[PDB]
Design a protein around this nucleic acid. Sequence first.
DNA 1: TTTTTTTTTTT
Lengths: 691, 371, 283, 55
Amino acid sequence: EDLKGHSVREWVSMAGPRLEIHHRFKNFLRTHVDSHGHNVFKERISDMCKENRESLVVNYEDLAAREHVLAYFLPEAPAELLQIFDEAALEVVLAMYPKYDRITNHIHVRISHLPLVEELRSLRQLHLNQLIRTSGVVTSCTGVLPQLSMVKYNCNKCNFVLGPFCQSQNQEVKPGSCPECQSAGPFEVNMEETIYQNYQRIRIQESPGKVAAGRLPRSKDAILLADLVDSCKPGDEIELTGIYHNNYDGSLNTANGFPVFATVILANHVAKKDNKDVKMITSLSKDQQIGEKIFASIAPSIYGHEDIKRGLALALFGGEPKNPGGKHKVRGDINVLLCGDPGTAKSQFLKYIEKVSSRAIFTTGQGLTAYVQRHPVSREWTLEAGALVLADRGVCLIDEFDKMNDQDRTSIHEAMEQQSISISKAGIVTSLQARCTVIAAANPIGGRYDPSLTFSENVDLTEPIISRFDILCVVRDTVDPVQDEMLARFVVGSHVRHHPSLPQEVLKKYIIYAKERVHPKLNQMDQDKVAKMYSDLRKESMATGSIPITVRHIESMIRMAEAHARIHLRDYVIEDDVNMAIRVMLESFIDTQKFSVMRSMRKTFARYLSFRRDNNELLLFILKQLVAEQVTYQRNRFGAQQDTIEVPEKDLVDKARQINIHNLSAFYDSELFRMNKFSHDLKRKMILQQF
Amino acid sequence: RIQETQAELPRGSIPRSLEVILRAEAVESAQAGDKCDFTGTLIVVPDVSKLLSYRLVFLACCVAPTNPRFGGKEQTAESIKNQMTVKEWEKVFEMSQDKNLYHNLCTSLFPTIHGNDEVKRGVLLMLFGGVPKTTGEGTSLRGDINVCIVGDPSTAKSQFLKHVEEFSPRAVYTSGKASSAAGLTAAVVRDEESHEFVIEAGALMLADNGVCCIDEFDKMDVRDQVAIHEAMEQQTISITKAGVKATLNARTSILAAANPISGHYDRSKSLKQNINLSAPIMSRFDLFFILVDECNEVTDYAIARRIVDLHSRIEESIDRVYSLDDIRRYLLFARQFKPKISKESEDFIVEQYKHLRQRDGSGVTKSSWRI
Amino acid sequence: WSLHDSLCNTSYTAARFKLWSVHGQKRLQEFLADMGLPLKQVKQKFQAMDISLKENLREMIEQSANKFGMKDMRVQTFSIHFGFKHKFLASDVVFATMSLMESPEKDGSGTDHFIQALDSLSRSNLDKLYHGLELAKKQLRATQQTIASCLCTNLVISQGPFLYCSLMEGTPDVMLFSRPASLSLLSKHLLKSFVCSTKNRRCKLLPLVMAAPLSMEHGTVTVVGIPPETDSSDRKNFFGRAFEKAAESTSSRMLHNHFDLSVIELKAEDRSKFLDALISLLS
Amino acid sequence: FMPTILSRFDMIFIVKDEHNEERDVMLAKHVITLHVSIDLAKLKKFIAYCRVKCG
DNA sequence: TTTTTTTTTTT
Ligand SMILES: Nc1ncnc2c1ncn2[C@@H]1O[C@H](COP(=O)(O)OP(=O)(O)OP(O)(O)=S)[C@@H](O)[C@H]1O
Ligand SMILES: Nc1ncnc2c1ncn2[C@@H]1O[C@H](COP(=O)(O)OP(=O)(O)O)[C@@H](O)[C@H]1O
Ligand SMILES: [Mg+2]
Ligand SMILES: [Zn+2]
């Protein structure tokens, strides 16, 4: 019988049960097929040996299936079963690979998903020395320090090395008196025969919103040994699995006044819970019309703003960070700066880009650089990373840009055109790297953006800073009846399906793929296609109170050139996406202009550039204004928010004569204006507007 | 560590405190901000560093709330509808079936306030609370509504707040001039015993899922109105300090009272010029009750009559139905539904949002804090 | 080199192991693991590898290559020692000389590299040999990055009686093979990788013909021809006649400039005019 | 700008902006001079010796 | 060598 009347701890420590368990584990290691007739621990051990990993995973459920008695002995006395399993897996591997002795000569078996997921606040004294599975964020980690594992001293009066004592993680090992000269004294270690092992200590704490319902969040310690160290960084969400081991502390006893012991989790398996094939992508990119299909995949909820959707999509994948051969270090990062009156889903545009992107971080402007910090655990005055070095390759989401401080302002600009920070702090003089794309949103002064002044006035920002941004989108608002329903219905419906009674799969894997397998090239056929525009537009802008497109705009345009090499896999500059690059680089410049200049420059260029746009949107641009202005008339004399606005026809083609389309019936058939709640009548000429 | 309850404080004294030691399965019954009722033995404890000096310590064995709203034993409609004693449940039903209920809670909650019929209603709808939702992405919609009052001197502002804070259980009361940033939201304190920086809970936290009554909201400093907005927006409280990194929940509803700039409320300007709150904060309230002391004379008889009545018949002339203990029960019951929206009501709502924007329309009139 | 960078580049284990497809790159890992060679010693230079591993390396490699289908792994060569640290195998001198004479970057007339390679055969010039071993490395690491192109892109056309390929200038490290002498080896290794790669039974026994651009100004390419590959190929090529008769039939412009006949320079426009007549001629 | 902080200098150049279309041809030139991407390296080492040898 | 609160000199 493998169960007799003793303590489970002391049953397994007896020679008989020890040997029985030892032989029992081998038979499971060698013979265990999984639903296909595959010795899983034959291929898995192999894949472990093809990397020199000395760590074997044992899923607990199968151990319970193929073995009824061990999977019940295990979480009772795991300080010895996990030792016997080591010597079993060793003798298995040294049979499947008889030379592996030259690789670390020691195997640890981890254990995966015990069936007893638990909380971090419900650990009571019942669980002392019992295998446990938990969860929660990690909030610290010391450095990987070396700890004694098999110490060996040497006597100071005889030149003889004492016995190889083992080190237990509760009390400093104590050597006796020299069995060769009885010279009991202060021995010192012998650095040459002693064996060491890695070591790291972390402080895990409850997840933010998971269980911390109406109280404060508790925390615990954990000790990662040799193979585990650096499995997790501050901010990760992990799920430990480890003996819950206690040890006596003399300080707590002097604070609480009672005999109180400290506890710590000797981690045994750490499995992160976070976010981590082309043959479709070939034709999906070869659709030739992936632009529209991807634009309406970001900003999943927020309606409208297919304008700024374009710019932010351009920013997300990025561009090409070419190295100029003249030692000029042009940058390959697109930085955006939103702005607009409060209540227009700017912050949501930030938060969704937090999710969709990768390796992203976030901050408010109300910590930007590395700073000296007294470590929670180690109690040393180290240096900690800021908020511009954690996006050293990804994105940095700044919020409340206006609320930055003078030191913060003088520190943000340095990283734009240099992308490299120096820290001559109290810690030590260093020079680190920072290659991030900045995505921020400012606010309008006076609680509303008013486009009589230039944008450089309502933004409340230092002038050489706005130059460090590529795109300048301006969010604005207006009381517009037909969009009131459009936005209301959306919000109301989003409140109907959220309460307890291109999808997000293509584009994440796509920003992973298309980030890598493209390297856009640069020919010289576009080199003269642009200057013909600059020579004109420079005069056109300088003529009035404005500064024309300058070199820091040509750089942004040429950066956004490749911004579509990532979507199309095109990677070849063509006179097609140059129509797009110039279009965007003027889109982000006509808006940041004066009252009558934002329209004079439009009347020139928006008709000059031959916007590669819909022929239909230019139809709407007319009658939308012609009905809005008529409502404005019929309010300033009557005041009644009338139900059905009425506008006869003749007015529309009068203004359509300027763009020379005169097409109404092919637009009347088009359902691209029914949504805007309009009408027309052949015999009445009325463009009847309902709402 | 427990602190002397409020109703025992001798006048003109700072409240004492003592250490209680829960030592069993009773180990996490008491949380911060609660009003439990401990029952154990008083013991003496030495100073173990020199093992003298002794200090008193309470050694509790049982702990239970001081006044159970439902005397059965102490979370959905049925778990509570079980503890309802026969009279309790035959009364809650009677009220829920009552018609004109929405006028017998006002008349029975604020029995000594003549007028302002449009403020009591808002206060009630604040007490009942909305439906808190969590979007699938991971964000969360605010479920409870916030309310601010702004008015002339001596118009019964602090009286609404005192009424609400003495009626409601787990609702805290603070002034604005005598507070702090790290006292409202959350602090960080060095416990030299553990020689570590730990988190202290603030007024916005030990009133969680209740109501925080801020009087004189516009006397707070410029930097103390920032920490409160960072909490009123995301419903959470971040901490990033010496060795502490955390994010705490705060699902309180705020009832704030303020004063116009220069004493009186000037009715020829927008709101942003009559009050000195920040710009962001004025957006996070979404219910304002501007009170004005219209120099009338038919009221100045009514208010006079009511005050002199209250002062002549001190405990009488208050004839409210639905005694105050009963309303707590009805309010603990009816705060466990999650009403839904029918399609007709959704259409009505979008039409009303249509009919609200255009009132602010140009030409005919003008209003304050644009819709 | 290191023991790892020389398995990934010998065009005899870079073919069997199929070290261009992630699916079979783990074969190398398994081969290393079957010997007890740490993955950290195998990546380091061979002269610095620990002394306890290299005892019987040349036997534990021949053995563990039977278990993978590579039984011709030991060859018969010679080796020379001069002094304290000078130890050459007779196939290192060859790969160094062969790459001093065919260095890509040209610094004068055609007989400027010849002299520098004739120099590095006497023992008084061990500073050129020891230098011509860094070109021979740079070449071998820029050949398995081309045979990896024409096999993860399938640029080996089966044009009938013979395979066929061609190159693109835009691909990096394709101007290195511009010389009409350093092109034969690239093709002869391409055939060895291909024959091992393809699944057909016909293509595995067809000779290859290759063309790569020579001169952009004259607009001409260079063309070679290599016998049908096999283990015991007699090595008796036959293209010096085919190309001659094909240029004779089409009556195009060709140059049989070298001493071997199977290398020709051809106008970029007479490519197809030549190739079709050749297809018909070989038949 | 006071007549005194202005007088703290000695040389005033009111720089002028030309928008001429031949000037714009110069600008179109300068466009690709950046689009693509007596020497200073000896000018500096010349000054370093000129400043220190003339009186 | 860290927070937080409170008083007084200084840019
Ligand atoms: N409408 C009213 N009905 C009944 N009593 C009233 C009314 N308005 C004022 N009072 C009484 O007058 C006093 C009002 O003082 P408070 O309400 O405490 O001051 P307040 O309204 O906060 O104004 P300030 O700004 O703080 S002085 C109380 O004693 C009320 O009982
Ligand atoms: N068009 C819209 N679609 C959806 N939600 C919107 C829209 N406009 C405003 N919102 C709401 O407004 C909130 C965003 O406010 P925000 O832009 O953060 O204000 P501020 O810019 O003052 O910080 C969102 O939570 C969203 O619910
Ligand atoms: Mg008051
Ligand atoms: Zn001794």
